[PDB]
């Protein structure tokens, strides 16, 4: 509705619609993860080495080939898994039989 | 230096605690009040926490 | 003493169960219905529960 002769004062930054949008987006984000797998079995020491491929200078080193012992369907079984990680997702700690752990464990 | 009133009230216990990593354990040495622990299965130095 | 109609319906299964304590284990056995278990890794005696 055009409201032909109405002049009104607006003030963004003091607008509470922003805060509601903020809270609803974050809430929906969190709700979407409720039924998803929690990767707690993966907070183990890793054994990380370099990638066996043609890596350009811009990628040096950027990726690591990490092996680890993952849990499996049965509690009395364990499996060897390896995967690629970005350097930014791992931290160069541990310093035992192995090299690196996941950033947020 | 424990007064008579406190004899047997505190115990110095050592347990293996979990750690940040699933495959690692640590060794922690803490004081407990006697009322929070219970001795078990005829072992002189073996205790468990009251409500496990 | 199993009648003909029940042959193969029940199995006597042994397993290592957890206990109240993280560092203590117990041997448990129980009877299961055949419909609740599945054979695995080509072993006559090796079974697991259907929903793992």
């Amino acid at each position: 509705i055009h409201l032909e002769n109405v002049t009104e004062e607006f003030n963004m930054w003091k607008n509470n619609m922003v805060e509601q949008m903020h809270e609803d987006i974050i809430s929906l984000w969190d709700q979407s993860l409720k039924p998803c797998v929690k990767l707690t079995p993966l907070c183990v020491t890793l054994q990380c080495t370099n990638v066996t491929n043609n890596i350009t200078d811009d990628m040096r080193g950027e990726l690591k080939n990490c092996s680890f012992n993952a849990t499996t369907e049965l509690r009395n079984k364990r499996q060897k898994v390896y995967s690629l990680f970005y350097r930014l997702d791992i931290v160069p700690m541990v310093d035992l039989w192995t090299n690196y752990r996941l950033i947020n464990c | 230096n424990i007064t008579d009133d406190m004899r047997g009230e505190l115990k110095n216990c050592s347990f293996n605690a979990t750690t940040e990593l699933r495959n690692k354990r640590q060794k922690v040495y803490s004081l407990f009040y006697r009322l929070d622990i219970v001795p078990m299965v005829d072992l002189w130095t073996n205790y468990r926490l009251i409500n496990c | 003493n199993i009648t003909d109609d029940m042959r193969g319906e029940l199995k006597n299964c042994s397993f290592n169960a957890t206990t109240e304590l993280r560092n203590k284990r117990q041997k448990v056995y129980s009877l299961f219905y055949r419909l609740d278990i599945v054979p695995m890794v080509d072993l006559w005696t090796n079974y697991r529960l259907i929903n793992c």
Epitope: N69, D95 | R22, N23 | -
Partner: antibody, heavy 132, light 106 residues
Framework: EVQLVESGGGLVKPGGSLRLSCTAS????????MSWVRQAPGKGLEWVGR??????????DYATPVKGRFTISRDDSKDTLFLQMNSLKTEDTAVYYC?????????????????????????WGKGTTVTV | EIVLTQSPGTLSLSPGERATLSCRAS???????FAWYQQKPGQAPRLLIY???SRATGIPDRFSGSGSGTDFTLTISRLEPEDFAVYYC????????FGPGTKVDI
């Protein structure tokens, strides 16, 4: 690759002092107990002493024949072990070695201590000398 | 102090033979505190067996052993070139002393 990098040895006389030390390589020392053993030429192995980590409380243990003149200390923070010698006897020439045990438990699950792969690594340094 | 002695002082066996070594503590020290090393001349000693039972990391399965009070034994099921070294037993009876060293020779 648990290594002990041993250094600081050399030619000394009884009327002096010497400090030998080992520094961690690969695997750290704040989580390990260390000891010294010496072997004079033509002799068997003689334990000098052992010091625990500052965790249990830097407690030391020494063989009777080396007490007082041979003491042991740790830095822990810089991963360095020391054998401190002062006013030695003419009986003290030997190759001294540092050593440590490494007890590593790989647990299969964060819920049940029943399943693990346990490994025990006995690690020795190269050997340095104390002389007469 | 703790005194350990060894026997025979020298072993003379061909590769492929069972080079059994024995040693004795003067003190009765429980087997839980028993260790047996192999020292290649010029090298630091290397633990073979601890707790008079469990095998150390890396150590070949030709090595085994046992013992009780003062009586301890080391078994090499088949002698190999890698075993021609001087062996030492050690007892962690609050003073971790060692025997004089036993030579395995041919």
């Amino acid at each position: 690759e648990v290594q002990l990098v041993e250094s600081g040895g050399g030619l000394v006389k009884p009327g002096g002092s010497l400090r030998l030390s080992c520094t961690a390589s690969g695997f750290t020392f704040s989580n390990a107990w260390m000891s010294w053993v010496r072997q004079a030429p033509g002799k068997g192995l003689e334990w000098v002493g052992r010091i625990k980590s500052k965790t249990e409380g830097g407690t030391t243990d020494y063989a009777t024949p080396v007490k007082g003149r041979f003491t042991i200390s740790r830095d822990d923070s810089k991963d360095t072990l020391f054998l401190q010698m002062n006013s030695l006897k003419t009986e003290d020439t030997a190759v001294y070695y540092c050593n440590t045990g490494v007890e590593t438990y790989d647990f299969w699950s964060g819920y049940d201590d029943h399943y693990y792969d346990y490994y025990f690594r006995d690690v020795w340094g190269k050997g340095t000398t104390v002389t007469v | 102090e703790i005194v350990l002695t060894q026997s025979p002082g020298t072993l003379s066996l061909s590769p492929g033979e069972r080079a059994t070594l024995s040693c004795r503590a003067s003190q009765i020290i429980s087997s839980i505190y028993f260790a047996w090393y192999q020292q290649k001349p010029g090298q630091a000693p290397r633990l073979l067996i601890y707790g008079a039972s469990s095998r150390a990391t890396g150590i070949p399965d030709r090595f085994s052993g046992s013992g009780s009070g003062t009586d301890f034994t080391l078994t090499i099921s088949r002698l190999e070139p890698e075993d021609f070294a001087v062996y030492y037993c050690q007892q962690y009876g609050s003073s971790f002393t060692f025997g004089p060293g036993t030579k395995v020779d041919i």
